[model samples]
Target chain A: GVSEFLPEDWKAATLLGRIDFGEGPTPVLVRGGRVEDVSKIAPTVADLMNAFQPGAVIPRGEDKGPLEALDIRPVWEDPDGAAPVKLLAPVDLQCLKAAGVTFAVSTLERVIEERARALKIRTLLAERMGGDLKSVEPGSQGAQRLKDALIADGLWSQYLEVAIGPDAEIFTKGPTLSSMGWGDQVGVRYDSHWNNPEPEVVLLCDGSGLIRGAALGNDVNLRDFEGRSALLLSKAKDNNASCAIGPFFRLFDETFGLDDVRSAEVELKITGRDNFVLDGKSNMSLISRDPAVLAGQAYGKQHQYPDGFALFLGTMFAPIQDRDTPGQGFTHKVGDRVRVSTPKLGVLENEVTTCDKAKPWTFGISALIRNLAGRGLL
Target chain B: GVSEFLPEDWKAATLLGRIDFGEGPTPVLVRGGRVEDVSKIAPTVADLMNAFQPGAVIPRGEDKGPLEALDIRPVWEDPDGAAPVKLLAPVDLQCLKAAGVTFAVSTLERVIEERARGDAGEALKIRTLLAERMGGDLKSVEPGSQGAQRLKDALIADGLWSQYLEVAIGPDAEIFTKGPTLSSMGWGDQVGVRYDSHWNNPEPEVVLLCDGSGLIRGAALGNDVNLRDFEGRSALLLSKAKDNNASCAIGPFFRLFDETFGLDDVRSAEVELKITGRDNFVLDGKSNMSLISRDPAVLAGQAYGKQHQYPDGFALFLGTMFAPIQDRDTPGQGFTHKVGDRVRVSTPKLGVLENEVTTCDKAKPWTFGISALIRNLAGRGLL
Candidate 1:
């Protein structure tokens, strides 16, 4: 059952993640169908990621158990004293950052969502300039022309400027160690009525701005709260368990590399217990800005991600399938299962739940530091 | 030289700071004119502040050096091999966050900067209109109240309202992440300006030191370095405008509130800023905290609440009223930094935080992130 969310070629993939075997959250290396604790080589997942470079050797640690023995049981379903090893988001100290409006469709959606509700403004703007945006460069001279023309029509928006400007819109999706992993319950704000999951390709970069691997992420967002005011982004996006990344972080290998991510295609499917289903896709090839360019903007001389960062590349998939009323567009319901999978990266699945009822995040940075020190891995 | 930057009654104040005594960055307590290593009790300044509860004991540690032995010398002036214990920004593992447009004057300046992107004649046009219309009511109106609502409508009718004004008059304040943890420069450090900008200035502000649970434990002076050109173009360029290598500076000392200092002290505190350029240009301004439209506690609550949480605590920069608009070189053009300009942000109680200006590329690279600090502390047996 656990293999359902893993990569198709799981044995060959150097999957990086964390697990709790009744001790503390320990970084693990999943290879050859087994889990090996890698705390000897590097203490936290952050340190282990920093050690990933060319010519660096990967060492073996004490084997914990067969990878199949673990499952992502709900917190209440499993007893803590006698529990299976729990998989966590494949990061400890890495900053959780997400790039916004990187795709043409998403940019227009933000622009339209601001002035009107979901379905009211979508058709009008899509008919006017939807086809014209795909061929335009993000910051090129041609993009500037569209900006001027759209402004003349009183339709140019803040999202449109960031979409066409030299800079990309990057915001912190969550704090360090705040994201949920595979089989975890993702959250949407309890008060939000219009919310959806944004499935994307996530990149794992080291402190030196090297893209070590890629994973699947769902930057759960609230459409109605953001539509009220763009400044409400922190409230709409950063609730507990609202950020999800994992299944496994597939490292760059002979077969999978950064170029593979540049050309990757991610498929998303949302299944609801109310007998509704929706399908979506995010083609990284159609993104306005290149993945490397976005990564460089987040890092470099301007800023440094010391423990590096897990960046959620923006998604183009708009869940426009009507979830309720015919003209109301899309919104998620509790118990909706979101599965995001790519060939190179693995499947990341989570159930939708209200932020208040999903889970409370009690473990934070202080507890993490205390645990690492008590384990003598500091 | 260092004593000149310490508080007037430094012997009585509870000053906290970080210093490199050759082992690693150590949290120290400066009281009665001497430095005591507090790593035994609390390893990081974040830990030390988090442990500040009622009826807590203040234990002493081995004295490392005297308070007067420190100086904010240029990085090139101090040789590394035989250098004295270097003073660092009094923060570790604390996220750097800032509140923008918290002051009415700052709000108007941001609107002016937005409407007047390097344009000279139109800047005064918009400036005169806003000054004439929003002069009396803008500063006195309670934000998000009925008075602010009416002022917003009046300003809107005159086409003088903006997103900046919306935040200034609306319920929510504009707050954003300034820099990463441990990335801020301290006193006597060369603060970097992005080499690409030509319209920028220092934002002298009173910063609040809060615990992860949003309790204000201390206060310090900070330079929220701003690039008017970058953010004036688009509000989304705030990260590029405010965050850079050695760009965020909060220092001199982190003064904890005791019987001597409290929130009311910050409310009436008068912060003064002075800038000296290589071209013999000098500009001076003062920030009267009483004129701030929003309270420090309100800003802290807006930042840290159920919607967001910072486990390692945070440092919040209360936005400033001093947005420089004097012609530095050309007529009608505002102030910008040269390579060797000196920026001083100080208050009588908070002391002085001085830094020389440099390009981001030439400033000291931020090499010691959290991981490095963890390993270094472990090696020193502090963990």
Candidate 2:
């Protein structure tokens, strides 16, 4: 059953992930259909990714079992009794951050959401500005002139500026150890009446700002909170279990790399318990900021994240389909299963729940430090 | 020589910090004039603060001599020497964050700055905004109140408000990530502004240390180095404007909260800042915490809650009001840092934090990260 989350060419894709069976979270390499332990090489996923060499053989530990045979459940499910094997977000000690408005449609949607409060410039808001977001080169004189032309019409907004500005809107998604893995229950603010799951590509970068691998992330957002005022971005984004990433991280292999991601298509399907289904797709080729450029913007000589960091390239699939009301657009209801998947990255499926109802993230960096130290992995 | 940075009543005040001797950076606690290593008890300041208890006896390590006896210099100044004992920023794993526009003066200056960038008539436009306010002073109106809402609507009518002004009076204060953990420079280090920034200044303010539970455990001084031009270009460039290598500075030492020192001391502190340039230009300023619009506890609540949780805890820089508008280079241009400018920030209750100004690209590169810290602690047998 769990094999459904693996890539169709699983044996060919060299997957790097972590799972907690009995001992604390252990880094493992899934290849040749076996889960081989890489803890002896490096303890955590953050360290292992940085230590990865293109052609060198990674020394493997005891092969736990065949990848398809192991029972991997969400970390939050195994609360009591015997310690059940569970999958974890394949990241540790890395700072969690995301790049917003990296897509033209997402930019237009944000401008619409922002304008809905005090500046409802209409659905043809893109047309009202006399241009499309894709036409202007971000941070260029053309983009500047667009702003000059739009401000006269009261169409300039914080979201549109970031959409086509030199500096992309980069914000903290959550703290370290805050993300959930495959089959985990993602969180939405209980107070939010308008919120939806944002599926996108998450790049795993090394301390030197090298993009080593990529994973699928659900950057769950609260449209209503952020729509009210831009100051509520943090309140809208960061919560108990809002950020969900994983299933498995696919590093650069013979089958995958930046080119694959550049031309890849990420598909999203949501199934509510009330027999509701919504499907959306995001084509990476349409991404406004090139993923590499977004990486440089996040980590250059100007800034550093030595433990490394993960950047969620924003999505173009802004869900605007009406769930109940005609023009109110879509919002997640509890028990909705969110499935975000690409051919190479595998599927990351999660259930939606209120923030307080989701499992509390008690295992912080302090807990990880102590656990690894006890295991002699430090 | 380091005694100049110490509190006058140093023997009575207890200090927690870190120093890199021949081994690696180790947590140290100073009390009764002795700098005692605490790595035996806890490997990091992040862990140690969480483990601290009121009236609890802390286990000590080899006495590293008196605080006055040991020589401590900037971590970057030591290039090839046999690991000289140097002071490091007291924090290790905690994320570095900041609250901006906490003071009325800072809010007005930010609005003026934002207006100055997009158009002319900054002085008159700012004056016109205050003149047209809803028959009340912006500072006296409680943020997120009905009055503030009316004031918000009133200012927008005249096309005189901005996102900065909204944050200054809105329900939510401007909270942002300053730098990553272990990325902060300590006292005597060179704090950096981006090389591309033509307009920037050092923000002298109080910093609070908290555990995962959102409790304030200690307080220290910090420099939130800012690039005004970068952010003024667009508030979207905030990450680029604020966070750069060695752009954040914290500590001389962290003074734990006790009856001897607590939140009230932070609330009333008049933090004095003095900047001296190689060209002999000088500027002196003060950020009175009493003038802050939001309480420290309230701001901390805004940062850490179910909405947002800093797991390893966080170091929060309370915003500063002192925006150096006095021109340094030209008539209209405000103050900007020159290379080798000495910035000393001090409040009698919190001691002193001093640093030299340098371009971010030229500042010390951050090589020792979480991986190195783990290896160092394990090698030292502290883990």
Candidate 3:
């Protein structure tokens, strides 16, 4: 019988390392030729925002327990029985491309000291946006319902599976962006305008200063104590929200055939394996979304593309879970999850296995989660 | 802007691998820093019949496609300014763990040997009575419609990015299990009913089996066909149509919960590595609804448990797609086809670290694809 045949005494070695995707850095472990330890990144908002911006965050009072409750770690081992070792590292949160908005970073050492100050600034800006109110009374029905509807519609997919990171606290306590909107509404205003070429043709190019304020969105204020109502545009984005990260960036690129756009490279600086520095730099010419930036120049100038709005709304709805099925209201659960099975079809089979000892280059996406917020083109 | 933090000379690495779980040796690959490979074993009906007895196949026709199409191979890279080295093997087309009374290959290396010869020489022996003739074509219908009512109702969730496997031959495609029962037809009395407890269950047990013989399913037999069909069965199974040399065996002491069984140390033979050798032995277990085996002794005759049919169907389904997905599908333009995203989960927090070391061990049932298939379960953990 086929059972008669079996291998002789066979054993496997263990391997471990890091996979820094420029988000930050994480550790990984492999044993028995299996990926055993995939330590969580402390489920922090900084890590979440930097790692999987456009990623989903489980709140304290959502339907299915927050992803933080799962406290899960992503990991794997060699299934084919090769070097029975495991290697892991943290994901590089910032992109060299995201920073300087200039060129893509290429090496390890140079990436770090090269972009530390820039990313730190972005982090600080996010923190300042939070205002004096450290946390809000957990999220309300509006956030949970929106989370559920988005997940139900098959959104919330690309996200980091960790316990904590740079910004975990912001998730469980409620979004600072929401609170920011409670005070001042931010919008885009461009003094100079330019028409985008490629993909089509346009000649409205004009050198101008980029100015922004609150036109599309409303500012949340603590006024009208008695029984007065307010008129804040709930449709716009709050200041503290994370922009486009890795997976979210790729989604928009693939969805819009914007692969030609130059991807933002993430730079990281680390002393051996301890202290670290980060940055996100990019090459803007590669993208056709200049209009996005142009639109960002003015506040509420009638978003040129309604589809952009729909897209962002959709992006916000990822990580779906079952509410009714699990009877847990709007918590993240299997019931609310929506998935797209894009089975592998063999695209870069050759690029991966080149005999040349040269370093391997991966294909990725470039954009922001907020960009998806704009839908319906004018 | 969140765009100021990026590296200068970061190199992204590419990883690849395939998991052949259902039959033969469960093959997997490892990439990056160092390359590694792993293998396992599978099971068969004859073994089920011998081990669980009364085992049978779920008689159904073949579809044009396997359990899944648009295979995904998401990649990951070092976003934190690291070397972009590519390592790891691709997971080939594999059989998924479906419902039905399917068997799990405790050891996957069995597929590396030749089929075992049948000893039932009598013209009307139990072997001949329970041959491939006892099979039927799988009926196809709309995914969410009534034609698939049984399947849909049994599934944990309604959506699945499944692949279509096998194509039906049609018409006079022998349907033996459908005819007069073998016992009623007197195919047992003369056979002397040779029952070997150690080999074919010394005591009484249940077995189910079926063969391939019937009309062709739709062009792409969706995951619905495999999942729901498997889910709806109490003690059922399907077959690979024509007879092959694949063999399956059972070790009574090999119980997951019954730790005392201690079957883990039962060193049978050595596991093979080469594909040709593994393919020749053909001792692999197939993941199909057409054939299955159930042991009342194990589950107290209360059908299979949630983990039973669920994971069983999953592993089997994975087996079916092992080879296919690796060779052709892994290199596609699909979303999962992105570089570095396949074998690793590029978390910037930990440098460019990977989730699963090898693509083989890491089963990427894309969040987009597996959501619906997980409905029935409590959805407690992320597999």
Candidate 4:
């Protein structure tokens, strides 16, 4: 039924990404399951788009067969063997904005309920009784009040509120590391213990606000900071190590219908010291909003969506919940591997590690206090 | 004493802007009050930055002598005589964000309090109190009460204020257009107003060029295009109000600053905006940096504080002056900029940037909204 709506002239979908063949990142056309270096055709992806309207079509057999092909091997299988395909974030990424609470509403509510129950107890213990989150018991006035407010009315109302803005980034290398430092601190700060990874489709738009393609994005978030207060969203979602999208992009064409896009499957898995510790799978059909809308909203009134701008459509499923009890979630460690993938989009794999020690925080205690307070740690 | 902190080798300031010389927009270096086509000096401003560290100095004479120079004729003397130079928003502006409530605190307070009072009366009469500003009002007040005290309290409560918001832009040239039409007319089912004219005024500000390393490379004058109505609609809809095609105007050239450029100097600097049109119109408003509480560095710091790196190096419109719209100022008196009007924003150091407003022949404003909303909500289980 969906195929009937497709354009008669439509062919197989093609992809584009920036690859390194020693010199620097160059845009390449990916079709026939091979990366065709388009640098010879056009210098940059923007230039290529300018020349060709919707389809940045590359002629068959242009610039030799294919510059590179997908390396479909796990890093642990043969790390050196799979090192040939080095891809950047596909675009020069001038701006990035994440759309929140766009999907997985039911699951997000569950997480919020769990957090409220935990905070209720923790707050009572710290106030009426004495001690920290660990020392306090789970039953108290604050805990009871929180429970009543949340369960009776369903706290989903506030938690389900929509959000959009300018927040996005990524790294060329796998195992992308995020810093624990605060705004002022150049380096060496407390790493986020509640770091979590969100796997979502990131839309890439040209200056005219046309959705040319999509990329797999791992929107890394600091849950602890986010859970503190909705007001501190910029702080929680905006930190340096927070956003990453890459591997490559799956370019779309006029014939690419909403039905075709919605049918695509997305999966996420996290690898820890041993086996797969976290996993999730969902279809594009489950997303709350159309991919086009997410991209359009980012483009906004009067503003032109510049070349290289990205919009990470909201996730379809909740992240890997770590803690058995409420008020807690998993924090990524130094050697954790996060893999987000779609059958056609390929894999966006990244490993977690501490920030480099080369640059240390310039300010000391005062900066720490401000940082802690902002994160609701204080 | 502050001068001692300046870089000892700090040279006289140089400016850079995009100019059209038969071929499309190209980077040109400005020195000795003249434009120098620096395309041969590495092709692009970004390329020029790569070659020269700390100072992306474009050697004079490497290119021809000046594309256009300042016309010294007075406005009344030769309004039509000296019209040569055509410039664009200096840098390839990759990103733009607006810092609200930064200056003109008093006037802003008056506007907010006025709205609050009006909403209070309207809500009580309607007995609904459903709109955003309902549950509270400026005291138990009526719409047009004690204009001053209400202003004071509103100032204290930056409660409804949105700190900063991201406003998107196209490439440097597309981000700004030579203005003549204050706004655009919509086509089809959409008929967007061209002259929300008063609403689409320019807020002159000091713009920053933040490098990949989070360093402030240079500064320029910017005309942060804003629609007053959209901003007033609701704080939540700021993106709709600020982010738009050709919403931001910047340039003339960048003033590369060094260590010696004291933050105080930036704070104390004076910025102004002038609107000229059919009648040799003059709508002049100027404000000093003292009106703004935060310095330029603090504003730039806030932008960088949120992210790790700005790989494409974005621009930050530090803040605007209040004198432009404050009723107390006589210079900013009655006059709305319409199509064919020229807006010029300048600082002593940043040089003048002038452009005429023009209407877009593309999509209608309503069409843009309805189409975008339908697509966004169609599958959201809502529409």
Candidate 5:
């Protein structure tokens, strides 16, 4: 089956809305509760140097300082008369109490489900706010980008586009020599690792995105390692996250008239306090390169970044909905439920899924979505 | 018609998930980055104060210490492929761009419709993510009372059950003045300026939510001399945010609530911010003693908080479809289109409104949001 993922060379373009309207210095205001200048406040005197010094840059490529003028302020209503929280009908918390079933929660799955549900509710309530303000869009770009990154990463491995296994499999030197690094020619057992795994064939490629060969385990590995040397063998296998997909790209490069390039693994981290950290080889770069991004402000003002795993729907055109129209002045009608097909994710069908592993992670993903307001697209 | 907003007195259960997933220190391994001193380096100065001076008493009931045995390491994933500068749609940058339009961006109305229209487009890509190991929920909350307090604050105003505006004709104020005051004695052409504008109204029992009476001329009136002498006349007006409603709540024994229990007005401030700044009156004592009765986390996690908003259809519920179950398990089939009443916000029915006012002021109340995976909810008993 064909994958609906974006083209390899396609670069995603994001438009962010970030305006701060809070009082006081915007950075100080959003810092909230406690404030500290890491340079001056670094703990073990040397630690300060580590965090602020030139060599300590984490993302390595892209980074931006906090916005100064975007002082966003959140409007929190008193939750005095809200309804009691409801558990799933059959799995009521009260009944759990009666049956000695404490809420017993943990792991990403539970939190994502509950938070997602609440956000959905919020989307509904927020939709009803204001008169003639119903047509403007609601979700922010930060949220959408985070969602897209997650789905892309999930699909990467699920598609079996690459293979990554333990270091021992790629070398014949065994665990002892590989761990200790003693013998000169004792490194990765390349023959047994890449080729002999569940998939019996191994396809090797060069930096030019050209496939050199497709050979069986013993037949290919024994010969290659013999030519490359033990250390080189280990180096090749250790670079699997980078190497496994070399062949696929070779094919992609040829078919699409593309060249050799690197790919990234992306995910977003949502702190308990709702801060966000984009996780990927180029996560920080992606964030730093884009201007007009509002993740920082949204996180600062709303007290929560986009947390809980979710899917991002796509728009049909470059710029889909106008911020506002003539008649509906300062309107705030949210359009959260309109469904459309995404070019990649396909029909925008939302569905739930649970973990079969010990952690029991649960979440739902939307199939695809088209911009209803994208000209005649919807 | 009576509004069916969420009732008051339900804070305990509304923001439950917040309580359950309170912001505690996350044990992230910060290797390769600039951070060092795992044992001594605290996330903040308070953390340093807490670690070095366990017995140090801080002002403002503050605590700056490290957690007892919590782990804070290094070696987290890299931050690559991020945007370098701020980005904004050309239209949001200026209201004039939306000149003929009659909509404000914050209206949930516009948000939902645009969402339905899928107008979010490439602006909102990176749809899904896989947090293989770096764990925790999407929201970052401070632990214990702080998250609770923030939640409490949010629940209070955002959850207006019955908000309305009452127009009072100022001429009859003397008829209700409890006793003679300088204003009552005709100190000024106007009843000076009522400290508590709602005092002389026929409905004394009802707490006035906002001083719909006074309107400030400009930024300067909020700071005046003899004008500042009045007790209850409001000083501040709008402070929360642009979309936030400007309202007030007067209580018994309020300095102004009582001083002007019946008086019409006198020297006082129209000072600072907008009438919303007048919220100080309500904050002084009226509902300041408020506390959420119970922990919403123990009740039902995030679900409680959702109902507090004025949810009319299934849009909010549809959002729930994306939420995870216990241990990150899939809950019910995610929200889908039933094609009719089941669909919450209809794309075809959407209407856009543009605010006549220029874009929000440089320093005004505005809000944004965050969306991330709730990785820790599973281990924290919030599912």
Candidate 6:
């Protein structure tokens, strides 16, 4: 219920995670480049926003200074004498919705050409054989023939594509990452792999279409699952604890641009096996989609954007190299450090581990299967 | 807070909607087929579930009798009762997760084969060919081997089953509407209520309202408004085709869950959908939930199992039956609803959700190019 304290001109940053203060996972408000404990002010970042009108300024106690004037520390940073309060994704988001192929036109074109070749070959085979050939499966003789046919005929100007959706799983950085090990997670399929993408700008929006703020977003993925079929994107991407967000929210003041904030050089680096296994860089200017439009698409659907959801605008640059062989691309194992960064926005670091090592808690029927069988319903 | 007033044997029904009792949209408690003002009981269904812990018994004041004993009327029954109050989709649901091809197995196979014949049905085509190629190392079948098998296997599999259960959170405006009319939609080139396209159909499903913690709170009916044309086009296009405005409908009222009638009982329940127009039987079908293999609880669990946390709660539309839609003009492949066609999804006890289809006009199509232009100007304080 606190109100009218933060001035319109003041910028504020909020993080969700626990601190030494003993409360588990609270929303820490950052103002004047210092962390202010907003736990006494509100329960969670989502609770604070939902309780008041968006852009409602709340008053402070004691000195009653502008929320901006309250001294705070860099919650994500540590000085020589002290440790940083463990930082979490800025908002305890209701959900995280991300779009794919929003930018990266070149990559979209590459994927399309590959599929069209397969289609054309299958079509030709069906015509030649007087049967319904339909299409060819990957790695089949028909698939190989299609590859050759595309090379023979200069008719591969394909434009097949998929529109964006917030279908990816939601992952909060600090809290989710807190107990996770770089190896061995439970409840996840053995085939699940830690796939990382080139970091992109993250947009935060309220229930209405207002652009609340922006931050660096890591669109962690399961590469093996995604490439199998466009239909499997949910399976590939929506595994347990698969994605994350936030070093801290770069709160916006009315407007920003994809061009203005585009990374000079965006990069993804994986440090594992006691060395940097891969370093990927891409020009942010190569972003084929604008962040604002993507944000608008996110708010396009009704009620989906309640309590401000996060969107990882697709990466213009991929962190892992495109595979050359049939099944070759980098997959993260335990003890891998995955970091995405831009000079303008800063970095978001996460440690990769199997769900087993971290023993991340999961909610599934495997636990209830016994109880259910006890009821004689199995 | 009302608690433990419901007798162990009592059956309770709850519906969320607005009434003429001088309040805007409100949640009214339905007990034994009678409407009782529960606004004094709890502010909203979400609040009621959140405050009392879902599945807790809620007390009934004064007249603690059978719901039949309560004075009530069929609010939507009369042709000229002058409408006391408008009904709405019961809950302010956070997300609507759905499963495809859950029941009506024969129909699901029929539809997939039909789509495989289309010119742009490349995805469907690949799936058909792969299924015919026979078994061995399905992982090598395609880029996403498991995914390819999923699509291909479901196409050939001889039972109604969920291809993949997916989640699409509802938007704040116009998703759930008490419709005398429904908007026929178009996104870019795709148009809903495609009369020329034989793929349009309505899926009637048993809908459930679950709390943030994944407990099933109540049950209702929902019409998963879908454009089969786009759906058959590609799995990725689902959010675009299904997540748009006025895309789905739920309601009439909610039936509270009790030991006597939990979700397991919902499995044996019958569900139906009928489409009618100015002239004749446009389309209709009926089937029991027993046809479905996946438990509603499992679906609810999967929705909450994601890394995301839903504080506001969610709504799940269980798999639907293909029985009625299968017996159409071409044995389950024909019939598209046009403007003025009434589509109804109904079941016993849950009541009926009726909506009329109306064509939509796209005077201003959404384009990202222009959106960026406006934001660019605004960012520069140039507007």
Is candidate 1 or 5 superior in DockQ?
1
Candidates 1 and 3 compared by DockQ, better number: 1
Q: TM per model?
A: 0.92, 0.92, 0.16, 0.62, 0.18, 0.63
Docking class of 4: incorrect
- How much is the lDDT of residue A345 in candidate 5? 13
Candidate topping DockQ: 2
CAPRI class assigned to model 2: acceptable
lDDT by residue for model 3 over A1-378, one digit each (tens)? 111110011013212223222332223322232332232432211222223333233122112211112222222122232422211111111111010101111111122234452444333322432421112111333323332332343321111100000101000101111111101111111110110000111011111111110001111111111011101001111111112111111122112222222232112111111122121222334322233342342112211111111111010111112223352212111111111111110000000011112111111110111111121100
Residue-wise C-alpha lDDT for candidate 1, range B193-292, written one tens digit per residue: 9888778889999988887667888899999888887777666566677878888999877888888888899999999999999899999888799888
| Model 3 CA deviation exceeding 4 Å by range | A1-366, A369-378, B1-137, B150-383
For candidate 6, write residues A1-378 as lDDT tens digits.
011212222243332222223324445555544456564565445444544555687444122234334232331232221532234456453345666654534543454456675565545644543444323332245433443443345422111223211222122221112222111121233456536544666776654556656666666666655454333455555444556565555554343334545544667776776564777777756554456766665565332334455666666554345332334666666666666666545566666654334333432212222222233322
lDDT of 6 at A118: 54
Candidate models: Cα lDDT each? 0.80, 0.80, 0.17, 0.47, 0.15, 0.47
Where model 1 places Cα greater than 4 Å from the true spot, the runs are: A75-82, A105-133, A148-155, A190-193, A271-277, A319-336, A353-360, B70-82, B116-122, B146-158
In candidate 1, list every pair of residues with a backbone clash.
Answer: none
Candidate 6 C-alpha lDDT tens digits along B1-383: 01121223334444443233323434566556455655456544554565567566676622323344423233224324344444445664234555544443423433453344222234245445544542232222232235544655553473422233111110000111111111211111112242333455566778877775778877777766665555454455445445444556666556667654667767687877778877566676677887664556666665564443345456677755652333334332445555555676666656566655543221112221112222232343322
Q: In the order shown, what is each candidate's alpha-carbon RMSD?
A: 3.6, 3.6, 30.9, 15.2, 30.1, 12.6
Per-residue CA lDDT of model 4 for A1-378, tens digit only, reads 212211222125566766555444456776654557776555456545544666545564244343333333333344453455444556542345566655533433455557675566435434533444223122344333443443344442233223211111111111111222111111111345676777877776764667777777777666654454322344455544456666556677553444565666878887887554888888787665567766665555534433335677767566557634355656666567777777656667766654342232221112222232343321
* Candidate ordering by DockQ (highest first): 2, 1, 6, 4, 5, 3
Residues forming the 10-long window of minimal summed lDDT in candidate 3 chain A: A345-354
How does residue B89 of candidate 3 score in lDDT? 16
Model 1 alpha-carbon miss at residue B302, Å:
1.8
lDDT tens string, model 2, A157-234? 666778876778887888777898888888998889999999899998887788888999999999986766555566
Per-prediction count of colliding residue pairs? Answer: 0, 0, 314, 19, 222, 31
